[PDB]
């Protein structure tokens, strides 16, 4: 069933604050995040952990590279985070201490698969899928799972897979930093408040819907588009990027918004369409400073901007979408809504499949 | 300010490389040896390799993880030096913060490196080609490039010295903590020293590429493809296109075609692989032949040792000896290089600096 939307992509758009709040509801215990949620052999494992090894594709790759930006300030534990077809052959070295942690939606995915089964002939102190499918093969070969409620997607791109994996991250984070005193129980408290809050953000997003079909009109005879983002929003601009590629077959690419220095300042030209997501964070001016980079080239810029820096925001000629974010672990989540909307219209537009068959 | 001869100083930089290349391993040796004396204190403290730049030196750092982590047998990490410069980091107990930069005054290399030194690494290193510069200055141990001065647009010579410098830092460490044999040692050292004659070979591709180029007049994008090692060459090459011909030209690792990259394959799209004689010859052609079915134009640069497997109906082929781990990444680097020019040669773009 469509549950009356057009689209089952448009659906799981849609059910995204459900899936989020159901899978933060899944690890509470009385509104607190709580380690008896998970399985009882997490924390001798989580007490042993001095590395984690992020290993995904697609994606859930892109949600791994988020929360390293969450697990190296918050829970303070060293990150890295690969892709999965890579480290598979790669003659790799693993730290003393290493958690492997894998992120699929499937739990079947070939490469992160056969990463996990490397990964047990080598030093690490056990391994975690973060996935959405019990039963799975990931899930049965981790010591532990700790599953996202998104229920099934049947959209070309996955949508509420990647922002529940987000969520999934940054519960983990809290859960880790708790049981190596890198946050007081005060700060635990107000970000497990800010994750909770989540839900509604989303459904603000959401609200954007008919202006971004508005705006995706300017797309329909594009064939590239640059998207921008910074620190944290840097792999949300890399997963915006992927979902317009792969629907609406734009060359789309994503760059860390300090490096349009050396490379993409070359391909922006006035046919050119810049996405960029600017938060209410400590890189504001430098975002700025680099988007006007950008417009000097003639770039037409697209913004999805939080609120509280909408009037630090002007450009000529551009388009803005404002709305309310939150902070560092909302922030993410939030601004995919929009550009998960874009990819949607602008595969319309084009006449491209959003479902699978 | 002489362009010796050369058409253009890009031109001229790119044929500059061999004399680069065995200038900089020169500098490194002793009596053709890899030797400490050519400091051991913070290599034999390091425990972990942090390693931050940007652009094309980033692109060197990323080539020379696969090295340090299988032969030197040291964990190690790549990172932007834009965003981790404002990033909230930890750093690993033992690290060693390596820069990378050609002029040592690159503004977010060079502010990671003063933010590093309020934190947990052993100490710090360069891999620059200006000495007298902040970063020079203000690291521990420096390892120079012998890059000269470059003015065409793109880096050539910097680029292909940083990974000789970083290939011979990978066995010094190597050596020091006993990851490899004194007899594997002096194989890959002896592997570094062929490296110019096998980048001579290649310049010999420059009139070939020359007429392939013709391909590139009326796209507006094109992909690269290479795996493991040859990832971080491909996004290389990709950055070239890029920076002179103004084509949006990007890479990606062969293994993940299976996401939209594919989507983006038709017939009027060029697709620029490199194929090394390595153990990921068999997948990279199944790779290829994927992207072959949905009527990509391919374009592959081979070893000759494996030629003959490589087998596609109207693809162009250019076939060159590239040695193994240590030189083909620099050896394969050469024809992208010389592509980027021709095609920028042919949009009627700029090659070098006003």
Redesign the interface.
């Known amino acids: 069933s469509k549950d009356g939307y057009k689209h089952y992509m448009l659906k799981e758009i849609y059910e995204q604050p459900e899936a989020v709040s159901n899978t933060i509801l899944a690890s509470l215990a009385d509104g607190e995040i709580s380690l008896d949620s998970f399985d009882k052999r997490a924390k001798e494992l989580f007490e042993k952990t001095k ?1 984690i090894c992020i290993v995904a ?2 994606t859930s790759y892109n949600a791994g590279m988020t929360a390293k ?1 969450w697990i ?2 918050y829970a ?5 985070v690969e ?1 999965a ?2 480290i598979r ?7 003393d201490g290493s958690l492997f942690v894998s992120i699929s939606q499937s739990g079947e995915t070939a ?1 992160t698969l056969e990463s996990l089964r490397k990964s047990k002939k080598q030093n690490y102190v056990g391994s975690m899928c973060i996935c959405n499918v019990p039963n799975s093969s990931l899930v049965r070969e981790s010591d532990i799972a700790f599953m996202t409620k998104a229920g099934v997607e049947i959209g070309v791109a996955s949508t509420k897979a990647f922002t529940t994996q987000l969520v999934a991250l940054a519960i983990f984070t809290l859960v880790i930093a708790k049981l190596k005193n890198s946050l007081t129980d005060q700060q635990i408290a107000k970000y497990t408040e800010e994750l909770k809050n989540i839900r509604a953000l989303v459904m603000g997003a959401l609200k954007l819907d008919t202006e971004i079909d508005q705006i995706s009109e300017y797309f329909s005879d594009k ?2 588009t640059i998207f921008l983002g ?2 944290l929003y ?1 792999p949300i601009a890399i997963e915006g990027a ?1 979902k317009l ?2 629907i609406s ?1 734009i ?1 789309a ?1 994503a760059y ?1 918004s ?2 349009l ?4 300042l ?2 922006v030209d006035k046919n050119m369409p810049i996405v960029a997501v600017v938060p209410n964070d ?2 504001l001016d ?1 975002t700025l400073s680099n988007l006007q980079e950008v417009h000097a080239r003639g770039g037409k810029l697209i913004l999805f901007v939080d609120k509280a820096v909408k009037e630090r925001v002007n450009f000529d000629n551009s388009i803005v979408l404002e709305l309310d974010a939150g902070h560092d672990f909302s922030a993410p989540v939030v601004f995919t809504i929009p550009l998960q909307l874009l990819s949607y219209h602008v595969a319309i537009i084009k006449g491209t499949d959003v479902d699978q068959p």
């Open positions: 590395h594709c697609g930006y190296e300030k303070k534990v060293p990150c890295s892709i077809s890579e052959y790669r003659d790799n070295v693993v730290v490469d064939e590239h910074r620190g840097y992927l590629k792969e077959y060359h690419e860390p300090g490096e220095k050396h490379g993409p070359a391909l400590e890189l430098k």
